[PDB]
Amino acid sequence: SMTFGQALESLKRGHLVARKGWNGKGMFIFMRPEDSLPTNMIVNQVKSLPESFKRWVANNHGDSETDRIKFTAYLCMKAADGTIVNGWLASQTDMLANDWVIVE
Template sequence: MTKVKLPQYQSIKIVEAAEIAKIEGQTMLLSFRKHVAKVEVDQTYLDKHQPQVGGYFVRYENGYESYSPKGPFESGYLSVETTIHAARVGASFGIAIEMLKDGHRVARKGWNGKGMFLRMVSGKQYDVACGIARDLELAPWIGMKTADGKFVPWLASQTDMLAEDWVIVEMVP
């Protein structure tokens, strides 16, 4: 195959995946969270992906099923549980944004105000009392609960974006 330099892309997506513990015909035994589950695949899947024990069975949001060797999978994905744990002990701004999108409230450990947090607000969750926005689509935004009990639109500072102390405050119901 000719080596052509292609454009690079970075992926931020959530997939379902589990390590393949055993392959018996068209049945794969998947190992996760101290459990084993059986997944039936057809011969087309086996021929196309040629899965190996130790690699990962991967299912995308749209239902597409694939295979990834262990090394590339583990270097390219973090478990959501690991990401949530990182966001409890101190995580990057990027992880904080993903947690906001998933419905969590986040804050920086370094913020001095009591009870401050950020929350994603969907366009459908707020109403504009003035007539200016009557015919406009209301877009999502990030709001901040301030130390004095107000809720205002928020913009990140350079310090906030580079910080590694973002934590989950609580889950939005």
């Protein structure tokens, strides 16, 4: 048996984990790391953000002032169809289950 709590501690240590009880097959979850980025980079360089958010950052930072924004750690899933889902969330079942397994 393995709890979500134990799976989370394995995730925090960099492992890939999954539930035997999921409907989809061949899936797993993993943690993406925290990073703190300079505001100028966010505004002028990061491709993976909408323009309205780059605008909010620019208007609160000016591409100046030694400024940084922390992007917190989060969970992701390699889904059944091979896509990567940023921001995996745990169902009630996932949270309370004890069929978790280390995938790698």
